[PDB]
Amino acid sequence: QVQLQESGGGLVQAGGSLRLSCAASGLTFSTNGMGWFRQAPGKEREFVFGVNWNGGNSYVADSVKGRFTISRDNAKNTVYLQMNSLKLEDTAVYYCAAKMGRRLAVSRTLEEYDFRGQGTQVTVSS
Amino acid sequence: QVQLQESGGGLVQAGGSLRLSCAASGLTFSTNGMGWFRQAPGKEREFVFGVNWNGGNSYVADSVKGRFTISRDNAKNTVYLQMNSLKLEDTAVYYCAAKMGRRLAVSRTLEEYDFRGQGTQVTVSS
Amino acid sequence: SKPFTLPILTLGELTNSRFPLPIDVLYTNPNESAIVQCQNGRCTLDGELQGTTQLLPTGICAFRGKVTQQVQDEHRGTHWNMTVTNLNGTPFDPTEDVPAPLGTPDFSGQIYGVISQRNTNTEGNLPANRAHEAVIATYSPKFTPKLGNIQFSTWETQDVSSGQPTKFTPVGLASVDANSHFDQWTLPSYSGALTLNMNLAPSVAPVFPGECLLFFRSFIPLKGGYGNPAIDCLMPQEWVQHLYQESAPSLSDVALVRYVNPETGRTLFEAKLHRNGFLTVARNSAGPVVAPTNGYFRFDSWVNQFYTLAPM
Amino acid sequence: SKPFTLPILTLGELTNSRFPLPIDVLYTNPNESAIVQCQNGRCTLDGELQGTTQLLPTGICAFRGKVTQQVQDEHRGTHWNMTVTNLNGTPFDPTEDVPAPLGTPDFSGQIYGVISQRNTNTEGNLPANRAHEAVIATYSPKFTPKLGNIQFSTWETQDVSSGQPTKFTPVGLASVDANSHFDQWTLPSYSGALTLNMNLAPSVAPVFPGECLLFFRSFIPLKGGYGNPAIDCLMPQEWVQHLYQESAPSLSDVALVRYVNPETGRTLFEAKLHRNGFLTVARNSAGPVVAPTNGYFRFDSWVNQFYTLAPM
């Protein structure tokens, strides 16, 4: 009964911003780790941003470090990927993944997670 | 830690002048109201001169109008009671009080104020 | 004791106390999870101004001061540092017991307006002038008005003069995009991100079950992009001005008021006007309150906190 | 493939993970018929905190919140309701997937401690305070921490304030008499008696015949009366803390560890440290394990479940 649902994606120009949302049911983000991956056609998947249960540890891909941030709304059982300055390299389907448990480590490979959503599309054009 | 400290009092002849100081800590006169009261032994408390936070409103006791004025050094967080032309009636202990808040009204009774100093003595002899 | 009153003003004669705009609608939003602790438009019922609240409609979200220099900044546009004074031109003393110079904006966002300058030196001994569109990012670590200086950016690349008197006239928001961080209930960090804000007007909330805050809402213009942003204030600026002049003692913690339609003489609904300066209503829905804009709130009586409002 | 390690700590440098006490002895009790399923001091060998386990030694059996009101209750003393928040002050969300706020006590009994308060409102603008001895009966129908509130009693009759921030500092037990229902292996009903506990760390038991659980035992103070009560945890708090930091992958279901005497370099006995976070030993007796308190468990190697332990 774990479902992860992404939204907030769209079409945007280089230098613009989006806020992605990942809402969960059957699972609370405050007690599990989660991560954002992205999948563009013709390219291997890439880990973007991951966080543990209490937000005390994270991993951020070097390519996005000063540009992407995360937040959470525990009441809404939702976490956000804030993409504050988008580059052409960023076009892709961004999806959400959860790994059960309260731990310190932030996994960077999809097969270590226990659940994933389908994603939401992000296109950076001009 | 609100403290109000009065100074500048002394012994002076009828027709002379003084300037009293009320310095504050824990409170800025620029954001609160303040007043001067006087207390001669064996007589009732008297309200002398009061002002609100920005000096835009004041009350001056009828007996001292034209003889007493007030000034500000909010850089020094100190206000002054300038007593030009002192009369024999004026002998007393002069003390200042502060009322929290930026308002228009100038309270004329000491129980409405929030803080008082001990005062400084003013004797008008000959 | 001087009796408490509100002015008799139609909704169309009220101005927002948090941005220089007419009030457009009364508005509720009972599901709001944010803490409501705005600092402009804050005044107790007995007339005590609080937070950064001052009396000038022209002072709301305005700054006065001096450009010191152009500065280097990642983000797009050209950037400038300016010292800010009090609105009346006297130096601002950071130790004054207020959160920030009175009128400082009280929300996170990219505030759009015009920076104008009139030089002090002198051509007929007439000073030179210039004005340009400008943006002030109140969420920025360089927004430190409680310390006496702020940053602003321009599209203009060089026509801003150092050491000259500078005025900011607020117009609206630059953007409500994700990276513009518009949140009308997040306070700026008035001294910078790592320092605590001080001397704040308190937060407001309903306490009785079934009640919610009632806001005076204005829609705020946007320099470009998509959106319909709004600024909600607790009391219009004219109430701030009238309560300050009146200095009426508050005879309880709650004044019952009635919104009346003078065309009919009838009460449309009633509301609690609370001592700290805000309204609650018994309403179970969000959105505009549809009411004749010639109507107005009338003081009815002082009531106790346990008074039960008729639902809206 | 980060290698798995335990900290190098004497027995006298270990803390109980189920009550804020030093570890006094290692302990076995192979004839225990109760199901061992404590919720504090639960951590997998790869560092996953489970049950109500959190990392603060000061959070174990602690509560943070607000007294709401005095309440009426048969039993001796005065009674008070308090809401409880998370230990860091953020509101506790009863739909969070934990059995109860982290740190909540995990056993039936009368827990003795001190309730203290520091008022939020304001005397030099210095808040008022008070503290009093208090008892929390975790077996009571009013113990509903998963629902966000609990009851406690005092001897003090009136000096506890409503609406003020409140802290419970645990000290020991009030009683181990019959009607005090001390049973360290009976879980509280975290939501109240008719509701199922949820999201529990699993029960633990030996599987290989001849083995028994090995506990880190602490004697718990008593407010009065007769008794020598003790609290047994599966792993000391420092192991919880170390495993969480290390996040080392578990290479099997069983880590063989040895208890070594650094004075001699020799192994005194060996134990199985199981993936879910508990120890078994091949021991056929109950009571303390007499070992030099300078000794400590050292990781030897990953083994399979059919490994035969040398008897103690």
From TrEMBL, chains C, D:
It comes from the Viruses. Residues 84-312 form the Calicivirus coat protein C-terminal domain. One of its GO terms (cellular component) is virion component. Keywords: Host cytoplasm, Virion. It is found in: Host cytoplasm; Virion. Signal peptide: none annotated. This is Capsid protein. The chain holds residues 224 to 538 of 548 of the full protein.
